[PDB]
């Protein structure tokens, strides 16, 4: 998260920290959010050979009692996710068991441009900076679709355009999969943006994927 503030520990109890394993490289990391006690929503590009989810984290380098480290049994990447257009960047993760509900861990129960939304994550705090030890959050402005025209594959139906180009505030690498909340309700999922982090950026529009989401939650 670029240009954000460190959150008060555990004030975002639905936040999930994902460690993703691949066969041919070291671990990678993403965000995500708990929407059922055994389901986490994240971005499809965060898929890998296997994933571990940590709930209840603030400083991800110091283990504490709030932590619940949970195995992911199955990954449900959206079947139409496209590695060229980046369309349908959404994935459900089924946890091996249901998480415990604590003060630090809970689910996130399932807008005109100009609205302020917020997004949290452990991602990099600058284009050349490492991932953040702690959960940061930033408030970002919802933009008209034309603000994102330079992303040639952007689609107003499938995606949100987020971030005032006049501010340096933005999500960045490692924040992928985290929810964008507008009015305390998840509206988007961090997906992609420019490599130099100049806003706006592109978020998955959750509402478009709701039937698919409900589908997976009923068949599993
Ligand atoms: C996070 O925890 C690590 C290990 O305890 C510590 O070195 C680091 O300074 C902490 N960062 C913050 C912002 O508290
Ligand atoms: O939101 C973003 N703006 C730039 C950017 C880069 C990478 C990722 Cl995962 C997200 C963003
Ligand atoms: Zn704590």
UniProtKB/Swiss-Prot annotation:
Listed PROSITE patterns: TRYPSIN_DOM (PS50240), TRYPSIN_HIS (PS00134), TRYPSIN_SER (PS00135)
Molecular function, one GO term: peptide binding
EC number: 3.4.21.39
Key words, A-Z: Disulfide bond, Glycoprotein, Hydrolase, Protease, Secreted, Serine protease, Signal, Zymogen
Disulphide bridges, residue numbers: 30-46, 117-182, 148-161
Protein family according to the UniProt entry: Belongs to the peptidase S1 family. Granzyme subfamily.
Enzyme class, spelled out: hydrolase
Protein name, entry field: Chymase
CDD domains found in the cross-reference section: Tryp_SPc
GN (gene name): CMA1
Primary location class: secreted
Domain Peptidase S1: 1-218
GO cellular component: collagen-containing extracellular matrix; cytoplasmic ribonucleoprotein granule; cytosol; extracellular region; extracellular space; secretory granule
Catalytic-site annotation from UniProt: 45, 89, 176
Function: Major secreted protease of mast cells with suspected roles in vasoactive peptide generation, extracellular matrix degradation, and regulation of gland secretion.
């Amino acid at each position: 998260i670029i240009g954000g503030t460190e959150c008060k520990p555990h004030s975002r109890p639905y936040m999930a920290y994902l460690e993703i394993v691949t066969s041919n490289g070291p671990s990678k990391f993403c965000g995500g959010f708990l929407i059922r006690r055994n389901f986490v929503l994240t971005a499809a590009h965060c898929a890998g050979r296997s994933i571990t989810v940590t709930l209840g984290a603030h400083n991800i380098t110091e283990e504490e009692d709030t932590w619940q480290k949970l195995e992911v049994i199955k990954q449900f990447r959206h079947p139409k996710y496209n590695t060229s257009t980046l369309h349908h960047d959404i994935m459900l993760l089924k946890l091996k068991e249901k998480a415990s509900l604590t003060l630090a861990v809970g689910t996130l129960p399932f807008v005109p441009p100009g609205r302020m939304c917020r997004v949290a994550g452990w991602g990099r705090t600058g284009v050349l900076k490492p991932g953040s030890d702690t959960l940061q959050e930033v408030k970002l402005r919802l933009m008209d679709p034309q603000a994102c025209s330079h992303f040639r594959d952007f689609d107003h139906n499938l995606q949100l355009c987020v971030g005032n180009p006049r501010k340096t505030k933005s999500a960045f690498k490692g924040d992928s999969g985290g929810p964008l909340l507008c009015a305390g309700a998840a509206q988007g999922i961090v997906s992609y943006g420019r490599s130099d982090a100049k806003p706006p950026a592109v978020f998955t529009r959750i509402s478009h994927y709701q039937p698919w989401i409900n589908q997976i939650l009923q068949a599993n």
